Amino acid sequence: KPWWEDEWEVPRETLKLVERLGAGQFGEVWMGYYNGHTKVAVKSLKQGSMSPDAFLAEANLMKQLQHQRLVRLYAVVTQEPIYIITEYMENGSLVDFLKTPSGIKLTINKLLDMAAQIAEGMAFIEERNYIHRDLRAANILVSDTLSCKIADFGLARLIEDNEYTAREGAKFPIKWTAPEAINYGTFTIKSDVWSFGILLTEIVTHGRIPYPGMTNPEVIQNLERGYRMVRPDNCPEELYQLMRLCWKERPEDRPTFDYLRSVLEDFFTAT
Numbered sequence: 001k002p003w004w005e006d007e008w009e010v011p012r013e014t015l016k017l018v019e020r021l022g023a024g025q026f027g028e029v030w031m032g033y034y035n036g037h038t039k040v041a042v043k044s045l046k047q048g049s050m051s052p053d054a055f056l057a058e059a060n061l062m063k064q065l066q067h068q069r070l071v072r073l074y075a076v077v078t079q080e081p082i083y084i085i086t087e088y089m090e091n092g093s094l095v096d097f098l099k100t101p102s103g104i105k106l107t108i109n110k111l112l113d114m115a116a117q118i119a120e121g122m123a124f125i126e127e128r129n130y131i132h133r134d135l136r137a138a139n140i141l142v143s144d145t146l147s148c149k150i151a152d153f154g155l156a157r158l159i160e161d162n163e164y165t166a167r168e169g170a171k172f173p174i175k176w177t178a179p180e181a182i183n184y185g186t187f188t189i190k191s192d193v194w195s196f197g198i199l200l201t202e203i204v205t206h207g208r209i210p211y212p213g214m215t216n217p218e219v220i221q222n223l224e225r226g227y228r229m230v231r232p233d234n235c236p237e238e239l240y241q242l243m244r245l246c247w248k249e250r251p252e253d254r255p256t257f258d259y260l261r262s263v264l265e266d267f268f269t270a271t
């Protein structure tokens with residue numbers, strides 16, 4: 001649909017950017033207000049830093065992935081500077097929130113709760129034949145009621161034929177990315193499952209960096225030996241054994257997100 005017909009199109013005049021939350025190579029991230037009252041998040045593109053089409057590709061994908069557990073597209077402004085406007089999450093990044101005073105006092109119960117909400121979200125993505133590719137605590141957002149939602153769909157893809165394959169020079173965070181995506185550039189929902197495993201260690205260690213004290217090459221070397229991440233401090237053995245299912249050698253042996261959700265819910269109501 002052209003912008004004069006796209007229901008997600010708004011006049012720039014509806015938006016007032018109030019506080020800049022982030023600034024990077026490709027633009028900024030602002031807290032704003034839509035029509036005076038509705039708090040939103042505004043992602044702006046820095047002209048020339050990258051292609052508008054590439055920039056807008058994220059919003060188009062979000063128009064297809066709507067669910068309570070995924071950050072919602074609020075609107076676009078398709079003339080320079082391009083704006084993407086999304087649901088505003090009051091507590092920000094999960095990796096950050098876990099490190100605040102409020103985050104620090106969270107019981108293992110509530111942590112398992114949040115882990116179940118993330119999985120519930122990825123389960124929806126799972127059924128829709130999508131993948132995320134960038135699943136990690138940095139890309140989970142928390143609300144003012146302490147709920148969690150998947151975010152940043154820049155790399156998310158639709159899987160018609162059951163596999164998406166990237167290019168040669170394409171590089172990804174080694175600690176969070178499954179071996180098959182690192183080695184062959186092949187991604188599936190099972191690749192996400194592996195990331196979800198890493199993400200679980202982020203949750204239980206209040207946002208600590210995975211594979212404590214190991215360089216990327218040490219991590220690859222260890223994984224190939226059959227080793228997995230060492231038991232994090234204060235990690236329920238049940239959770240650790242769940243992480244391990246996520247880290248199974250063969251993608252098809254790794255559990256579904258629906259299984260992961262239901263298991264995390266038993267864990268949560270049990271404590």
Ligand SMILES: CCc1cc(N2CCC[C@@H]2CO)n2nc(Nc3cc(OC)cc(OC)c3)c(C(N)=O)c2n1
Nearest residue numbers: 021022029041043086087088089090091092093141
């Ligand atoms: C659309 C993608 C994106 C990126 C992003 N970013 C980008 C940089 C920092 C934050 C995630 O690390 N934040 N930060 C947010 N909230 C936020 C950020 C804070 O950081 C100053 C502090 C907060 O609590 C006072 C809340 C939100 C959001 N959608 O509400 C957000 N969204």
